[PDB]
Design a protein around this motif. Structure first.
Motif, PDB file in Angstrom:
ATOM      1  N   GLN A   1     -75.514  61.262 -55.545  1.00 10.96           N
ATOM      2  CA  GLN A   1     -76.707  61.308 -54.720  1.00 10.96           C
ATOM      3  C   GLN A   1     -77.943  60.899 -55.534  1.00 10.96           C
ATOM      4  OE1 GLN A   1     -78.580  65.141 -53.769  1.00 10.96           O
ATOM      5  NE2 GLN A   1     -76.703  66.146 -54.465  1.00 10.96           N
ATOM      6  N   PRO A   2     -79.049  60.548 -54.851  1.00 12.17           N
ATOM      7  CA  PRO A   2     -80.247  60.076 -55.553  1.00 12.17           C
ATOM      8  C   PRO A   2     -80.921  61.121 -56.447  1.00 12.17           C
ATOM      9  CG  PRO A   2     -80.403  59.645 -53.192  1.00 12.17           C
ATOM     10  CD  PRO A   2     -79.266  60.584 -53.395  1.00 12.17           C
ATOM     11  N   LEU A   3     -81.553  60.628 -57.519  1.00 18.63           N
ATOM     12  CA  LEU A   3     -82.311  61.414 -58.480  1.00 18.63           C
ATOM     13  C   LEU A   3     -83.777  61.081 -58.290  1.00 18.63           C
ATOM     14  CD1 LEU A   3     -80.116  60.683 -61.648  1.00 18.63           C
ATOM     15  CD2 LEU A   3     -79.856  62.502 -59.942  1.00 18.63           C
TER      16      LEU A   3
ATOM     17  N   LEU B   1     -84.903  62.763 -49.280  1.00 14.87           N
ATOM     18  CA  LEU B   1     -83.808  63.129 -48.346  1.00 14.87           C
ATOM     19  C   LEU B   1     -83.500  61.994 -47.373  1.00 14.87           C
ATOM     20  CD1 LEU B   1     -84.449  66.887 -47.575  1.00 14.87           C
ATOM     21  CD2 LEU B   1     -83.030  65.891 -49.365  1.00 14.87           C
TER      22      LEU B   1
ATOM     23  N   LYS C   1     -81.604  59.461 -49.443  1.00  9.64           N
ATOM     24  CA  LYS C   1     -80.247  59.951 -49.605  1.00  9.64           C
ATOM     25  C   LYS C   1     -79.390  59.669 -48.372  1.00  9.64           C
ATOM     26  CE  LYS C   1     -77.822  64.362 -50.477  1.00  9.64           C
ATOM     27  NZ  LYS C   1     -78.018  65.684 -51.130  1.00  9.64           N
TER      28      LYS C   1
ATOM     29  N   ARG D   1     -79.989  57.388 -45.919  1.00 13.52           N
ATOM     30  CA  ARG D   1     -79.810  55.918 -45.790  1.00 13.52           C
ATOM     31  C   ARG D   1     -78.675  55.439 -46.684  1.00 13.52           C
ATOM     32  NH1 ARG D   1     -85.205  52.994 -47.071  1.00 13.52           N
ATOM     33  NH2 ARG D   1     -84.069  52.789 -49.050  1.00 13.52           N
TER      34      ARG D   1
ATOM     35  N   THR E   1     -70.414  62.618 -52.755  1.00 15.87           N
ATOM     36  CA  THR E   1     -71.519  62.203 -53.614  1.00 15.87           C
ATOM     37  C   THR E   1     -72.446  63.353 -54.012  1.00 15.87           C
ATOM     38  OG1 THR E   1     -72.848  61.594 -51.673  1.00 15.87           O
ATOM     39  CG2 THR E   1     -71.545  59.848 -52.749  1.00 15.87           C
ATOM     40  N   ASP E   2     -72.071  64.584 -53.686  1.00 11.73           N
ATOM     41  CA  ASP E   2     -72.933  65.725 -53.973  1.00 11.73           C
ATOM     42  C   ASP E   2     -73.144  65.863 -55.482  1.00 11.73           C
ATOM     43  OD1 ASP E   2     -74.387  68.195 -53.112  1.00 11.73           O
ATOM     44  OD2 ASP E   2     -72.828  69.139 -54.307  1.00 11.73           O
ATOM     45  N   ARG E   3     -72.077  65.612 -56.235  1.00  7.68           N
ATOM     46  CA  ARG E   3     -72.126  65.527 -57.705  1.00  7.68           C
ATOM     47  C   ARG E   3     -71.487  64.229 -58.138  1.00  7.68           C
ATOM     48  NH1 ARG E   3     -73.642  70.262 -60.066  1.00  7.68           N
ATOM     49  NH2 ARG E   3     -73.653  72.086 -58.692  1.00  7.68           N
ATOM     50  N   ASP E   4     -71.711  63.859 -59.401  1.00 12.53           N
ATOM     51  CA  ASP E   4     -71.150  62.626 -59.958  1.00 12.53           C
ATOM     52  C   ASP E   4     -69.672  62.589 -59.662  1.00 12.53           C
ATOM     53  OD1 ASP E   4     -73.655  62.207 -61.087  1.00 12.53           O
ATOM     54  OD2 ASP E   4     -72.947  62.234 -63.160  1.00 12.53           O
TER      55      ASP E   4
ATOM     56  N   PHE F   1     -66.488  60.171 -60.402  1.00 14.16           N
ATOM     57  CA  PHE F   1     -65.937  59.051 -61.171  1.00 14.16           C
ATOM     58  C   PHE F   1     -64.590  58.615 -60.629  1.00 14.16           C
ATOM     59  CE2 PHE F   1     -68.748  60.979 -64.265  1.00 14.16           C
ATOM     60  CZ  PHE F   1     -69.325  59.877 -64.875  1.00 14.16           C
TER      61      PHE F   1
ATOM     62  N   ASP G   1     -71.180  70.180 -63.748  1.00 13.47           N
ATOM     63  CA  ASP G   1     -71.368  68.787 -64.149  1.00 13.47           C
ATOM     64  C   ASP G   1     -70.759  68.514 -65.532  1.00 13.47           C
ATOM     65  OD1 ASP G   1     -72.671  68.180 -61.757  1.00 13.47           O
ATOM     66  OD2 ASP G   1     -74.608  68.739 -62.541  1.00 13.47           O
TER      67      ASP G   1
ATOM     68  N   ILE H   1     -67.155  67.973 -64.838  1.00 16.77           N
ATOM     69  CA  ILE H   1     -66.897  66.649 -64.258  1.00 16.77           C
ATOM     70  C   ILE H   1     -66.861  65.614 -65.398  1.00 16.77           C
ATOM     71  CG2 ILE H   1     -67.914  64.757 -62.908  1.00 16.77           C
ATOM     72  CD1 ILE H   1     -68.925  67.034 -60.962  1.00 16.77           C
TER      73      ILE H   1
ATOM     74  N   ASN I   1     -63.686  63.443 -67.034  1.00 16.23           N
ATOM     75  CA  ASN I   1     -63.767  61.981 -67.078  1.00 16.23           C
ATOM     76  C   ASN I   1     -63.448  61.411 -68.462  1.00 16.23           C
ATOM     77  OD1 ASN I   1     -66.132  59.384 -67.141  1.00 16.23           O
ATOM     78  ND2 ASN I   1     -64.365  59.401 -65.834  1.00 16.23           N
TER      79      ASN I   1
ATOM     80  N   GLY J   1     -84.787  66.056 -60.504  1.00 16.14           N
ATOM     81  CA  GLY J   1     -83.344  66.226 -60.460  1.00 16.14           C
ATOM     82  C   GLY J   1     -82.744  65.579 -59.240  1.00 16.14           C
ATOM     83  N   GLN J   2     -81.589  66.093 -58.824  1.00 18.32           N
ATOM     84  CA  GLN J   2     -80.912  65.563 -57.655  1.00 18.32           C
ATOM     85  C   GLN J   2     -81.708  65.922 -56.423  1.00 18.32           C
ATOM     86  OE1 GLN J   2     -76.960  67.624 -58.067  1.00 18.32           O
ATOM     87  NE2 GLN J   2     -76.240  65.507 -57.975  1.00 18.32           N
ATOM     88  N   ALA J   3     -81.601  65.080 -55.405  1.00 15.06           N
ATOM     89  CA  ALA J   3     -82.231  65.329 -54.104  1.00 15.06           C
ATOM     90  C   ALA J   3     -81.957  66.729 -53.581  1.00 15.06           C
ATOM     91  CB  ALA J   3     -81.763  64.309 -53.104  1.00 15.06           C
TER      92      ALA J   3
ATOM     93  N   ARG K   1     -75.850  76.019 -56.836  1.00 14.07           N
ATOM     94  CA  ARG K   1     -77.181  75.500 -57.124  1.00 14.07           C
ATOM     95  C   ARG K   1     -78.172  76.649 -57.210  1.00 14.07           C
ATOM     96  NH1 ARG K   1     -77.425  70.060 -56.857  1.00 14.07           N
ATOM     97  NH2 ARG K   1     -75.554  69.087 -55.962  1.00 14.07           N
TER      98      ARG K   1
END
Lengths: 181, 192, 193, 190, 184, 189, 193, 191, 188, 193
Positions: free
Chosen positions: D119-121, D139, D142, D144, D164-167, D169, E125, E128, E132, G129-131, H168
């Motif tokens: 997700q976007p930073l 938001l 995110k 879009r 996509t909530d967290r990275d 791979f 994280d 994760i 990886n 940070g993250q959205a 979170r």
């Protein structure tokens, strides 16, 4: 760091000994003033011994010390114990008449004030004219205490002028060079 | 992004950057701060253009907050010295030495685009040292102030004292106000 | 022959890069911060394109967060001054002075790609000094704020009061919202459509 | 130092302009205004050279600025040529979005590539009112970007959101299964 | 700085002879330049060998694996020649040259190890990223096992810590095929 | 060279010893630290005796207006007359504090520099916020000018004119201006 | 006997300083930024004074630009919690959290000296940070903004909508304006009057 | 401004205000949890137990948290000593701060009304070989699990609820924290 | 001042005479440039001598040993000449020129020593890096022994600390073959 | 077609600059510090000029404060090794290694302009570490000091004992003094001479 005996400066302060050591700034000037006022409150008639080892510093801070020396009732004897340069030499020379001393190896230096300013030309001019008034006053103070003509002080402070104690005595910046008690 | 190139076909090819290409059209830019590098480049271009043709106008486009007076006055003097009329055009900001250079363009040929900011002021400086040297430099900067005010007076038609009063603090003008004051001759919106 | 490269490493490099190729097709980019360098380079390209042909459209691709208002208003003025219509196209971001330049494109020829971010705001400034000079600089920035609001009102068709209200704080718009607001004329997704 | 190729009079090309003659474009390293704009300029150029021939867009990127990257994405969709995409090391964040945005059926990865989605930073400091404006915006961004991924992969929006909530791979074969690419390619002769 | 020698810089002249260098750190820039040169050489002639001279301490795994994959992908055999150091990703690239065509000069230093990395943030994280890098470690070991002919377990044991090899040792291990002292 | 001790049985730093004589120093820049310490000393001295004069020695280039105006207001608020004495520099907020001393009890030593000027500030942000802060500093400038007018006896117009740029005065000139009441050179006067 | 100084150079210094002397008179200062250090020191003093006498007023002298909201609201809460009335007096600046603490003093016992600057505004924050996390922190700060507005409404007697309107941007008030607004009860010029 | 002093007549003796409140069995955690701050709390807790093993201790918390190992020493000391340690949040109790708050004696965990309570999963970081990365990742997962178990125990929540709610950053008002079981009482006035 | 041109830069013009310089530190950039030049010159003409002018304090051993190996590998004899300093890997490269074709100008400074290294970490890894630098030290000593004709034992003793030599002393030791002062003089 | 510039920006810039045009007249400059880069470039030029014409004089203009001895002595040796006479000309400063190179020019062809500053001294060095290594480096710099003095003695005609004495501390000379000392042969003021 300072041994106990009181710390040693506090013990010497009780014998009416005050030091200016290092740069003249608001902190060091004010500490001297506080000691002079304290000593006058303790006994307004006894001499005070003001030991000077200083390259000078801030003119406004130092002229506070100079003024307090003249204001208080006690004669303030001045003693150069290393360097008395710039405001340091003014303070030396402003000690009580006949009570201005140096140790034989001291350097006494007299010069014109140093300053500076950055800004609009109008403001540069205001500050330039101010430092010229200060220059004129400090020269008049030296002329007064040394017995030199103003024109002599003006010429002799145009550049840094380093004197040994004997030269400084001849010039009128001090009254006595003292070698042993 | 950096300056692009134009290729001119020859009887092979030559390359010119956009500014070199516009120099062929007698267009010279002062962009950003006035310093020895930027002022000297303008002077070199002005001299080159006079060498290429002493009688054709030069178009000097100005977007500057000013900077070093000595560097800038070289540009000003060079503009007056050379035979071609140096038309000036403010394309964003003409402040301090920027506005002096704008106001110093050829009579009737000083322009601004409509949204430009023009600002006039008294010089800035500074010096640290002995009271004697402070006085030397203070006297000098007052002389410079007077000279710059006389230049502005000459080119605007304002009395010297009006220029003095109006530059004591930073004075921001819109293009129309700059025209009315005499710092430029025309506000231009469209080539037409 | 002049060598070809993707991008010149210096402004005086003797090589024909991708931007030079596209300048031949009357495409000019504003990319990144608006400052004296970037603004003046655009102005030089616009004057050059005008001298090459005064009656052919110029395509001004904008991806910028804005920056210096004086530099940017030189570009805006040059766009209006020159004879060619300057078509504007947002290709990522058009914020602050970037959105002003976008909205200042020729009537009916202001475009955005579909995912672009458009942001309008009031000007930012700053000054330190004496109260007298603070007041001078405050009065100036308020005049600039007013001028910019009038530019936006003109090009969008919005009332001035609406522009003032909507730029008081950062106002982010997607491309369709920017079209509805009058900052652009068309959102374009495919060359074929 | 970029090596030179001379072609027959004669013209010198940097290696990248030489490959540009074969309609090869690279995105290499971070997505920012400089790198994105250079890619966009090359795509526009290649369309102008021929609007029907495929373009081969090689991607090795950890991603970067969303606005800059979305200009590349939109340019890819806009131009007439199909933009084939090829991952040659990393496609993460905006890198994987550009990879997944290649022409239908022409999205490739070499076998050892790492593909990452997230997700976007963002970030902002200021008054609460302004924090809210910026939060609402990121938001929307995110959302879009998730819809774009959903579109190109064939996954439901809800799955893109979860994943996509967290990275996240993926190996090349896993990215293919996910719909981020169409083919893993190991040799030209196959 | 690079001399000139048609007038080319020396690397461009050697590129014309199908000679490509990786010199120094493997990063996005250096890896991509090699890739561009390999694709160019394939376009010029898909059948002729390419000579890939390596002197590198390694660097970024993802950038390096793009080079490795491009080497396997293109039609030309890519001969590799170590001319100094081949460490970490440098050794993987040396070892991934064409079967029978991986060389080293006699004094070269070859080094193999496990991947280096790191991450900071929430425990979720960290996990994760840890998972990886373990997959990357596994993949790179399988790549080395494949090209050297060693068992996977042997590669795992021998890369747990930095493992330095002389050129003859690297040949015996299967990282290269030949140690070459003179052309004649 | 640190703070000497005086023993009277209890040890005092030299400054606390002088505080027994109702002497308080402002030395160096006016900031929240230095201002608050003066305010605390003034409140303390008032609590010791609400009728006895306080002697406030000033050697300051000024500094933060809000910090300084707290000292000014405390001087006016407490019952004791606060005598002020310039012992080197009284510039900007420093000269305001000097001029704010009790009527007839504002002094300078002969060599002091007294300087008056208008407020300095600075703000970065949106035009709306620039305007807010500009309006505020103009109100502060006006209020500080009215304070000076009050204590000096100069008209507001004169204060505005004379503080537009840095204005340096010798002690005798400050006296004639109304910033102090007496220049003192010797305790026997 | 314990030595007397003007100010301690260290927290554990065995000397009785000017602040110590005034604390004996139930005087407590907040001077400079509100942070964990300065906030906790005020709290400790308030708890100590309550333990010395739960039925004597405390005089809380405030000169602060504000700072950390969590730290400051501990002070606010402690003021309300303890049995003694906490009189507040502004002696230079009360801005942001500083003005909240001032306005939070005991009913009828909130003062300013005449030249003080009082400023109210909405909270400031920041996060990167993250959205998802940006949204968490945005929601939180908005709840904080609403709570602080409700606190100001309660102590001033202004309606919530007035507080919200008047704190959207920095709002500077002179002492008399602060009294009229209900942030303080009295402007005091002289102890005698 | 620094800590003032109180003089107690005997000659005279001086205490700083925190030392004076320590006489009333009041202990502060203020600011970041680190080895210094944690150890000073532990030393005060042990001292107070020595002075009187049966009387309550009042542990005032205003902390964003910090080092887990240092903080878990405080947590353990609070459980180990004989006196009940009442906890009071007086601003912020975040991360290890909320754990310490929540670990106060049953029924004696308090907050003032405006306090901010925040619960989260642990933060860490490591750079090195993949092997060592794995070692440190395994460790922080075990720490994550143990901290969740501590919170579950003191709140009464199911472990999985804690896991879900700390994935979170989770900010709570004092009343929300009480409802959740992190404290027992929100207190506005002593009376 | 910067490299001048002829209607080639000066170094390119000299490369036409098969002159290659190592100037300054040995690192990946400088070593690889030398290797590229040697390969180029060999490809232009594999029979003609190459003249390798060395002014270097040394540097990275892996980079420099690539140059050493390339000098031995290519078909041309690589004549070496010290034109200022040849210290550490600089001296090794000077000594490694073709038999009978290693020169120095008269005032040049030659210096030989043992390898410099460095490592921080776990004891296990310290041991690994220590073992490796010891093998490198041995190999470099054996290289010097081979080119000088000195016994290994002598090389070890004489390289334990920095060992500075004048050109004539380097010649006597076997690090070079000839000291040359004038182009017109008989080579001695 | 090779473009003309006053000065090159980069080593392999394709442009014929002022220095390249003067190198065609067998003019070579040492300007500024002697280091590996500056020394090696002089050497390269000297070897090139020798290949172009082995008989014609080279004019080596020196304006240098000196620098690294090893690098500089490569220039000195190259000057003695190559066939053509290297005439030296001091055009500002020839200090330390600068003066050695001045004085090492061809017999009768060492010049200075009238206002140049010439300075001779002993070597500067420095080492830190074990006492054994300090001794090694000290012994080495003493040998260097000896050889350099012998070089000055050879070219000046001064006895070694005179050079040792006169270089123990910085020894500044005007051009006429340097001629009288033997460091140059002529002081030249005019082209018509």
């Amino acid at each position: 760091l300072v041994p106990t005996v009181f710390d040693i400066y506090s013990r010497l302060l009780k014998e009416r000994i005050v030091f200016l050591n290092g740069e003249v700034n608001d902190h060091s000037a004010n500490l001297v003033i506080a000691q002079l006022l304290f000593l006058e409150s303790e006994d307004p008639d006894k001499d005070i011994y003001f030991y000077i080892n200083s390259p000078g510093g801030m003119v406004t801070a130092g002229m506070g010390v100079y003024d307090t020396m003249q204001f208080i009732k006690p004669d303030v004897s001045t003693i150069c114990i290393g360097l008395a340069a710039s405001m340091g030499s003014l303070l030396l020379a402003g000690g009580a008449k006949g009570k201005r001393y140096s140790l034989p190896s001291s350097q006494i230096m007299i010069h014109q004030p140093l300053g500076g300013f950055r800004g609009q030309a109008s403001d540069i001019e205001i500050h330039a004219k101010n430092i010229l008034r200060i220059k004129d006053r400090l020269n008049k103070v030296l002329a007064h205490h040394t017995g030199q003509d103003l024109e002599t002080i003006v010429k002799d402070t145009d550049r840094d002028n380093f004197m040994m104690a004997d030269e400084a005595k001849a010039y009128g910046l001090i009254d006595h060079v003292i070698e042993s008690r």
